[PDB]
Design a protein around this ligand. Structure first.
Ligand SMILES: CCCCCCCCCCCCCCCCCC(=O)OC[C@H](COP(=O)([O-])OCC(O)COP(=O)([O-])OC[C@@H](COC(=O)CCCCCCCCCCCCCCCCC)OC(=O)CCCCCCCCCCCCCCCCC)OC(=O)CCCCCCCCCCCCCCCCC
Ligand SMILES: CCCCCCCCCCCCCCCCCC(=O)OC[C@H](COP(=O)([O-])OCC(O)COP(=O)([O-])OC[C@@H](COC(=O)CCCCCCCCCCCCCCCCC)OC(=O)CCCCCCCCCCCCCCCCC)OC(=O)CCCCCCCCCCCCCCCCC
Ligand SMILES: CCCCCCCCCCCCCCCCCC(=O)OC[C@H](COP(=O)([O-])OCC(O)COP(=O)([O-])OC[C@@H](COC(=O)CCCCCCCCCCCCCCCCC)OC(=O)CCCCCCCCCCCCCCCCC)OC(=O)CCCCCCCCCCCCCCCCC
Ligand SMILES: COC1=C(OC)C(=O)C(C/C=C(\C)CC/C=C(/C)CC/C=C(/C)CC/C=C(/C)CC/C=C(/C)CC/C=C(/C)CC/C=C(/C)CC/C=C(/C)CC/C=C(/C)CCC=C(C)C)=C(C)C1=O
Ligand SMILES: CCCCCCCCCCCCCCCCCC(=O)OC[C@H](COP(=O)(O)OCCN)OC(=O)CCCCCCCCCCCCCCCCC
Ligand SMILES: CCCCCCCCCCCCCCCCCC(=O)OC[C@H](COP(=O)(O)OCCN)OC(=O)CCCCCCCCCCCCCCCCC
Ligand SMILES: CCCCCCCCCCCCCCCCCC(=O)OC[C@H](COP(=O)(O)OCCN)OC(=O)CCCCCCCCCCCCCCCCC
Ligand SMILES: CCCCCCCCCCCCCCCCCC(=O)OC[C@H](COP(=O)(O)OCCN)OC(=O)CCCCCCCCCCCCCCCCC
Ligand SMILES: CCCCCCCCCCCC(=O)OC[C@H](COP(=O)(O)OCC[N+](C)(C)C)OC(=O)CCCCCCCCCCC
Lengths: 99, 175, 171, 88, 98, 51, 347, 83, 115, 96
């Protein structure tokens, strides 16, 4: 904050909802709890300038969980290849993928 | 298909936005906002939040009801405009539809559209969670924590509503 | 970046419990007190390992005790239990309160034939301790090496040399 | 920018233009000095309609006391110029 | 970002262009203001509900609370604009500068 | 620096209060009867209503 | 308006700005602006005249639009980072939307058309709040997200603000439009040094607030809102003419006055970053601001404009307005250059 | 004391509905502080097991953690049954 | 699904009746029959002319009071938490502020319709 | 009357919830084997569809970490029947 009154007085006004890995009602986790924990712990104290370069592996894993861009593309590639073969009848679906 | 229900609602969600963004008579503008607020309930309801879906719809039905009363009092003319009455309104309505059509056409054919952000077209169902919750609704638990965790949010939101009533009386006193 | 390790279709195969939800619900309280050790040990593996693939062997013993649990009901309490879970199965919410008469017959057949006692209200909700020879995992999150903290500034504080040193100011 | 200044030539053109549209005045024998009654043959109420056509062309109210003295196209221009201070 | 986010963000862009392009009525622009809030509600809820960010589930509710305060405040000004000119046209509000 | 566009500009009011605009809108006129249950059959009550 | 209600509304303006400055959560930052906007409109509409209603409507439409962009930036930030912390934004599109959103709130060019109008349409006391207190919250956010701000975007907004503010004020005779354009130009300096040294953004902000409060307070003392009206001051309160002269010269950035401190320090930090062309352009462009401050001095202190006969009836009454802190603010706005090294207290 | 039972009588004659409102709302703010059963409302909520009771790893020095759910150790709901 | 069919059936039935109403009966249309009804005499002015709202202030207050249900409807779930002392304090706090809001607009003549 | 009954309804809810806890270990075990089997079925059919793609590694992870990541719906029911996918995604929300 601009003025860190919360830190001075030791009162939590809005730091309880800043991150999804903090305490949740009934200990309900978030889908990317593990990834946020690893990125937060990697980049603690070292500052933002260092964390942008040294916690890049964790932040790329964390962003993958959030938006699933790499995952969706991979599913897109498998889907596209399967459509081509089944279009020309070169691949036979297994009994469980269709029934 | 029924696997594209969210996408179909989202298209209707946009068409309702091109309804009141073209700015016809606020009577018809308020109708588009009711339509988009109804599908908006459906979209939010298909992602696991039913209280949120029925609350925004419930709130926006109250607002438009007041806006209807104000429209007949402050924002009316002899010939209220329909989407087909002005070249300006019609041009904005057709432009919005043609732009939604091409966004839908490309995102369904290529399954990949890039406008500022990279968007995917594999279906909204591909990002859902595969683990069922317990014996409760997660959205209900989160909202119910406004009174145990969000004490500071209750104070500011409570004060704003109280100050809201005071403010509107001052503005409308006149003379 | 690396292939995902997956068990074959021979380590995931086990004799499954093929009874419905009303059967499981009708026998949950006795099931949670007779097969407590094998499946409280599975859950400790599940929460510590944080990986389905690391607790398959523990999971098989859960399906093993469960099958053993139902075989004993089929030998001694076969008939009273059938009249019980059929009453629970009728209700759309599978309420216990509407089948209390049948529950008494099933709770006494097991008590006499097998000696089982139905846990009291709140027992199955306790946090229990389980003895396991499985080692406690280290780095279950597969965390890398954390970056080093910046050199902490030490020493005693001395006044600035020649004041602020801002343009012409001497203080 | 500022609208074109009103000039005695502009006013006279407007007065003739209004009278030309009137369907009772013959455009041939219509000068800037012809008398409405004795020359064009208009009657008392016809002259009233002409004055009202002038009220719309320019956009100011001509009362009855003044409108009775405006008996030809010239005095209308003289009255119009006087009101707008278009000395020219 | 799934294809639903494409249309939800398109809706926000439509209402932004709607607000920034007034026609005549001030009420017509206030509807675009409420349209933008509706989009922000759906986008916040979709992100929060899909990530199981439990505590964030109250943000959309709090978001609506202040949305109606703006809408209520906007109607208060529209009342006084019409009390002075008989219509809510925005071309009447040119007494300043001009 | 006067120019063409700002030729029509006028200094604002001394106390920042502009004159109230003369009559702008009229009341709604309603025919109440004769074919009205409460008009007693043959009454044409022409009411000027505000709200 | 009942005095009790007026105080409560003022405290809600302060409470809204304070929430922004003490919040580590974006939703609370957004709530602060909403609360601030809710309470500021009534003060604008306290004299209930058509100009006041027009000023409030234009200020509501501009600030409500910026709030939408502010929330959109927050939500995009959430999608790409999964957190609400008030720190560097994690998506470039989010940074652009919040930088433009906070430029609209401040009135920076090219989102500047409302500042001259709203100020002209509201009382002087309300205009003092708009030009001084309303810059505390937007700047307090720009002070925390500056690592993620696009350098070309923020510097472009600064150059335009200095040019637009300097050129706009030359055509003004109304004192409230003059101070509105003066605010726009000074906003350019504050955000021009933000990428390089945020502490100089605060130093410029504090000096500007002190000098603007001094100017508005002396305008309220004589109830003067036009150049010619301010020209009668020498025949009623000659002391007030000298204080106005000293403050205008200070705002112009002339040594040895206090207004030269921020410009002097901003040029230093920029040049240390090998930015020579921009400070030279900014310093020269600020001569436009100095010019229309000098016309005010010519018609207020350095010459004796014509007066009116009824002015003789004011010689027999004292100045009964409060003029709170005016003696202290004039000294701070003209005699602080010798204490420049004290700017380190802001770090 | 005479005046006090003259303002109350006036409001009870001119605004009985508001007298009931402030009485009902007043009792809502006070009784929870004085009620001896407010503790049990909090204890019942804790005793409701929404989540799974994840077991602890027996390190040999947890005498107060039950080994089996039917053991005397751990919290008991005997109070709730008799409530 | 079952809701979509229930909604689809309900409105399809209503649409059929409207379709039947306009196509089954015999029609005889002329200008006089379709003229607006104002009790036998021709209307004076369009029905689209402004119609003043004398309860506008209450209508705005309705929006602010209509949000409280959004904040107050979650109370049944909020009562299931372990922090009843905090939850109870903030539940009564929010309702009390609404009561103060109503009290202010009531004593200040805000509930009285303009004349 | 209402308070006595609401107290009996809490004692019944606790009993109802304890039945779930008694079964969760068994239901948890089956879910692990069903998710792992469905992931191998997808992997096996990915090897028979992406054999000719030049730059393809079958079953490659998209994360740098080797930690287990809960599969999302697409990774689990990717090449499945539409109806089967429909129930898993929207079956619960649409059940009434
Ligand atoms: C003020 C700046 C000048 C402005 C002139 C205009 C120019 C404007 C442009 C400004 C340019 C930048 C700033 C100026 C250049 C300074 C840059 C710098 O390097 O700073 C080094 C500067 C000098 O430090 P130094 O080199 O280590 O010590 C020099 C000597 O050894 C002396 O050190 P010392 O420790 O041995 O003795 C201190 C000395 C003070 O210093 C000096 O006098 C000379 C040294 C200053 C440096 C030279 C700067 C050039 C200007 C000289 C100013 C002459 C001051 C004397 C004025 C006449 C009064 C005797 O004498 C005392 O004051 C004794 C202490 C008194 C105790 C006070 C206790 C609190 C009570 C307050 C009472 C208030 C008075 C009420 C009056 C009631 C009347 C009825 O330190 C500073 O940073 C302070 C800067 C401000 C200077 C203040 C000095 C005067 C203080 C009294 C105010 C008198 C009025 C001032 C004139 C304004 C009239 C309108
Ligand atoms: C760096 C530090 C430098 C800071 C510079 C502060 C100096 C401010 C200039 C003095 C203003 C003045 O002379 O009063 C005339 C003027 C009175 O206006 P008016 O047209 O004569 O009539 C007003 C009502 O109609 C009159 O209605 P009424 O007569 O029926 O009763 C209402 C009553 C109401 O009395 C009050 O003024 C209530 C006081 C609330 C503030 C309480 C302190 C905070 C705790 O009247 C007044 O307004 C009293 C005159 C104002 C005295 C205010 C002195 C304290 C202000 C300085 C501290 C700054 C705190 C922030 C100000 C609020 C921000 C929006 O004062 C104002 O209304 C402006 C308020 C101040 C806004 C500027 C605040 C400075 C921003 C920088 C903050 C630095 C951190
Ligand atoms: C931090 C602690 C610093 C110590 C500050 C304590 C004194 C400040 C408060 C004085 C006060 O009550 O009036 C403030 C102030 C009075 O306004 P004023 O018109 O500027 O005072 C001059 C009148 O002629 C005043 O004339 P008056 O007839 O109205 O009353 C005479 C007044 C005499 O009070 C005074 O002497 C007023 C002048 C004192 C200075 C006020 C400005 C604060 C200066 C601190 C900042 C210094 C600059 C920072 C350093 C920069 C250079 C490194 O006596 C008192 O009120 C007794 C105050 C003790 C209670 O009242 C308020 O703003 C609201 C309270
Ligand atoms: C003496 O001085 C004078 C006056 O001063 C006193 C005057 O005033 C007047 C002015 C004169 C007049 C106003 C007319 C004079 C004569 C009169 C009779 C009027 C005066 C007074 C009366 C009391 C007459 C009767 C008044 C009332 C209010 C009687 C109310 C009757 C009812 C039956 C109401 C109760 C129930 C119902 C259901 C509503 C009734 C109406 C219906 C249409 C109901 C049925 C509707 C349906 C739609 C049926 C269902 C249809 C469908 C499609 C659904 C079903 C099918 C499915 C598939 C679902 C004069 C001239 C005068 O000289
Ligand atoms: C990307 C597509 C960009 C949007 C272009 C879509 C076309 C929209 C223009 C539709 C036609 C129209 O609005 O009128 C043309 C307009 C002139 O204004 P107009 O309202 O027609 O005034 C004369 C009649 N009243 O002229 C215009 O405003 C054209 C603006 C360009
Ligand atoms: C359409 C199009 O092709 O133009 C997009 C234009 C350029 O942006 P871009 O395509 O990202 O740059 C080239 C990278 N291939 O960029 C544009 O013109 C898009 C302008 C959209 C309005 C932006 C206003 C802010 C709204 C923020 C919400 C996010 C906007 C992106 C989503 C809208 C599209 C669904
Ligand atoms: C994907 C990412 C990109 C998404 C882009 C979203 C925008 C698509 C268009 C949706 C509709 C937007 C609202 C329509 C704007 C509008 O209301 O136009 C107002 C203006 C009114 O003019 P008027 O007072 O009626 O007088 C006409 C005299 N010529 O009308 C006019 O000035 C003339 C008519 C203009 C019609 C075209 C305006 C829409 C095109 C905006 C493109 C900018 C982006
Ligand atoms: C720990 C926090 C909990 C406490 C919360 C504190 C806030 C309490 C108030 C919240 C609700 C808002 C009501 C406050 C305003 C009271 C009504 C009012 O102000 O009306 C003013 C009234 C004007 O009426 P008038 O037209 O002039 O004619 C009658 C002459 N008095 O004239 C008047 O003077 C009003 C007459 C006096 C009204 C006294 C109201 C007392 C309310 C508290 C009663 C509690 C006691 C009841 C419970 C006892 C236990 C059973
Ligand atoms: C101005 C109006 C905007 C455009 C409206 C849509 C029609 C034009 C799109 C052409 C491309 C196309 O064929 O897209 C059709 C899409 C995709 O649907 P799908 O289930 O994936 O169909 C394909 C897969 N099948 C064969 C398994 C079913 O249909 C939509 O869900 C778009 C919205 C439908 C209209 C709702 C608004 C009324």
């Amino acid at each position: 904050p601009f003025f860190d009154v919360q830190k001075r007085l030791g009162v939590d006004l809005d730091r309880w909802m800043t991150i999804q890995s903090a305490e949740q009602p009934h200990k309900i986790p978030s889908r990317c709890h593990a990834f946020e924990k690893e990125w937060i712990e990697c980049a603690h104290g070292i500052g933002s300038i260092r964390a942008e370069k040294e916690c890049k592996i964790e932040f790329e894993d964390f962003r993958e969980c959030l938006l699933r861009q790499k995952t969706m593309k991979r599913l897109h590639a498998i889907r596209r290849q399967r459509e081509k073969l089944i279009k020309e009848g070169k691949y036979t679906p297994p009994p469980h993928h269709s029934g | 298909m029924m696997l594209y229900i969210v996408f179909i609602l989202s298209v209707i969600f946009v068409m309702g936005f091109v309804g009141f963004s073209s700015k016809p008579s606020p009577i018809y503008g308020g109708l588009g906002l009711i339509v988009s607020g109804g599908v908006g309930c459906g979209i939010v309801l298909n992602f696991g939040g039913s209280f949120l879906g029925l609350m925004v719809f419930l709130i926006y039905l109250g607002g438009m009801m007041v806006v209807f009363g104000y429209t007949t009092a402050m924002a009316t003319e002899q010939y209220p405009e329909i989407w087909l009455s002005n070249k300006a309104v019609l041009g904005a309505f057709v432009t919005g539809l043609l732009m939604e059509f091409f966004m839908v056409y490309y995102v369904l054919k290529d399954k990949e559209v890039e406008v500022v952000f990279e968007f995917n077209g594999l279906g909204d169902w591909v990002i859902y969670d595969t683990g069922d919750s317990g014996f409760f609704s997660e959205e209900a638990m989160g909202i119910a924590a406004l009174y145990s965790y969000g004490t500071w949010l209750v104070i500011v939101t409570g004060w704003s509503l109280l100050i809201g009533v005071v403010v509107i009386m001052e503005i409308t006193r006149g003379n | 970046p690396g292939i995902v390790e997956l068990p074959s279709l021979e380590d995931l195969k086990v004799q499954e419990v093929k009874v419905s939800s009303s059967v499981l619900k009708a026998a949950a309280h006795h099931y949670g007190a007779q097969c407590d050790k094998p499946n409280k040990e599975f859950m400790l593996c599940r929460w510590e390992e944080k990986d389905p693939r690391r607790c398959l062997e523990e999971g098989k013993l859960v399906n093993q005790c469960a099958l053993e649990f139902f075989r004993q009901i089929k030998r001694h309490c076969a008939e009273p239990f059938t009249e019980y879970w059929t009453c629970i199965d009728y209700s759309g919410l599978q309420l216990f309160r509407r089948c209390r008469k049948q529950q008494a017959q099933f709770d006494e057949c097991v008590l006499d034939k097998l000696g089982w006692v139905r846990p009291d209200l709140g027992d199955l909700s306790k946090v229990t301790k389980v003895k396991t020879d499985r080692p406690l995992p280290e780095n279950p999150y597969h965390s890398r090496a954390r970056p080093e903290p910046n050199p902490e500034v030490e020493g005693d504080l001395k006044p600035a040399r020649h004041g602020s040193r801002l343009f012409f100011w001497t203080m | 920018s500022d609208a074109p200044p009103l000039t005695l030539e502009g006013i006279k053109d407007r007065v003739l233009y209004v009278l030309k549209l009137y369907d009772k005045i013959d455009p041939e024998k219509l000068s800037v000095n012809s008398h409405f009654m004795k020359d064009l043959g208009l009657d008392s109420l016809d002259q009233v309609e002409i004055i009202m056509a002038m009220e719309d062309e320019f956009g100011f109210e001509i009362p009855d006391i003044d409108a009775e003295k405006l008996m030809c196209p010239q005095e209308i221009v003289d009255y119009i110029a006087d009101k707008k201070d278009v000395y020219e | 970002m799934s294809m639903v986010y494409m249309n939800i963000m398109m809706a926000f862009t439509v209402s932004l262009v709607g607000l920034l392009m007034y026609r005549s009525h001030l009420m017509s622009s206030l509807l675009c203001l409420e349209g933008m809030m509706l989009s922000l509600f759906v986008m916040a809820a979709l992100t929060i509900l899909n990530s199981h960010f439990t505590l964030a589930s109250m943000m959309p509710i709090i978001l609506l609370v202040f949305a109606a305060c703006e809408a209520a405040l906007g109607l208060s000004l529209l009342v006084m604009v019409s009390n002075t000119y008989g219509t809510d046209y925005v071309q009447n509000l040119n007494l300043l500068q001009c | 620096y006067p120019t063409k566009e700002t030729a029509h500009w006028k200094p604002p009011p001394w106390n920042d209060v502009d004159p109230p605009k003369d009559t702008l809108v009229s009341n709604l006129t309603l025919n109440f009867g004769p074919q009205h249950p409460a008009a007693h059959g043959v009454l044409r009550l022409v009411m000027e209503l505000s709200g | 308006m009942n005095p009790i209600i007026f105080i409560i509304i003022l405290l809600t303006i302060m409470l809204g700005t304070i929430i922004v400055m003490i919040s580590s959560h974006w939703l609370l930052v957004w709530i602060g602006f909403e609360m601030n906007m809710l309470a500021i409109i009534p003060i604008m509409m306290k004299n209930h005249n058509p100009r006041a209603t027009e000023a409030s409507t234009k200020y509501f439409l501009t600030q409500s639009t910026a709030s939408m962009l502010l929330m959109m930036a927050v939500i995009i930030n959430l999608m790409f980072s999964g957190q609400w912390t008030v720190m560097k934004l994690f998506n470039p599109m989010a940074s652009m939307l919040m930088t433009m959103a906070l430029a609209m709130k401040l009135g920076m060019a090219p989102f500047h058309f409302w500042v001259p109008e709203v100020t002209q349409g509201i009382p002087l006391s309300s205009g003092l709040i708009l030009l001084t207190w309303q810059k505390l919250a937007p700047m307090s956010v720009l002070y925390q997200i500056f690592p993620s701000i696009n350098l070309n975007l923020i510097l472009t907004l600064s150059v335009l603000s200095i040019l637009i503010g300097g050129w706009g004020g030359l055509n003004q005779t109304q004192l409230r439009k003059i101070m509105a354009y003066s605010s726009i130009a000074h906003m350019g300096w504050m955000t021009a040094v933000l990428p390089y040294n945020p502490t100089m953004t605060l130093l410029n902000l504090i000096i500007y607030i002190i000098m603007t409060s001094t100017m508005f307070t002396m305008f309220m003392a004589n109830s003067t809102t036009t150049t010619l009206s301010l020209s009668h001051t020498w025949n009623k309160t000659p002391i007030m003419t000298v204080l106005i002269l000293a403050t205008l010269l200070s705002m112009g950035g002339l040594p040895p006055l206090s207004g030269f401190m921020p410009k002097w320090m901003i040029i230093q930090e920029m040049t240390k970053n090998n930015s020579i062309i921009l400070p030279t352009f900014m310093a020269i462009t600020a001569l436009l601001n100095l010019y229309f401050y000098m016309r005010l001095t010519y018609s207020t202190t350095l010459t004796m404009f014509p007066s009116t006969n009824n002015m003789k009836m004011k010689w027999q009454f004292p100045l009964m307005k409060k003029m709170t802190f005016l003696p202290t603010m004039v000294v701070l706005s003209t005699m602080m250059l010798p204490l420049t090294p004290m700017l380190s207290v802001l770090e | 004391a005479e005046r006090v039972a003259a303002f109350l009588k006036n409001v009870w004659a001119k605004e009985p509905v508001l007298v009931a409102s402030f009485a009902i709302a007043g009792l809502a703010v006070i009784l929870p502080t004085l009620s001896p059963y407010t503790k049990y409302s909090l204890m019942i909520n804790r005793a409701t097991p929404y989540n799974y009771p994840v077991p602890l790893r027996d390190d040999g020095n947890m005498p107060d953690v039950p080994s089996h759910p039917q053991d005397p150790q751990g919290p008991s709901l005997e109070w709730l049954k008799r409530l | 699904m079952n809701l979509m069919l229930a909604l689809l059936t309900n409105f399809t039935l209503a649409t059929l009746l409207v379709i039947i109403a306009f196509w089954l009966p015999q029609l005889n249309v002329y200008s006089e029959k379709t003229s607006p009804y104002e009790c036998g005499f021709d209307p004076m002015g369009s029905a689209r002319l402004p119609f003043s709202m004398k309860f506008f202030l209450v209508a705005i207050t309705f929006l602010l009071f209509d949000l409280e249900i959004a904040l107050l409807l979650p109370l049944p779930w909020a009562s299931q938490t372990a922090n009843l002392n905090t939850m109870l304090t903030m539940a009564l706090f929010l309702i009390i502020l609404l009561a103060v809001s109503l009290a202010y607009e009531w004593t200040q003549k805000g509930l009285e319709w303009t004349e | 009357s209402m308070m006595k009954w609401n107290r009996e309804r809490r004692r019944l809810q606790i009993e109802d919830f304890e039945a779930r806890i008694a079964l969760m270990p068994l239901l948890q075990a089956e879910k692990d084997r069903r998710v792992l089997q469905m992931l191998r079925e997808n992997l096996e059919e990915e090897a028979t569809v992406m054999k000719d793609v030049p730059g393809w590694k079958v079953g490659e992870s998209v994360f740098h970490t080797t930690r287990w990541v809960t599969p999302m719906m697409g990774e689990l029911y990717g090449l499945r029947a539409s109806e089967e996918v429909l129930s898993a995604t929207y079956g619960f929300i649409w059940y009434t």
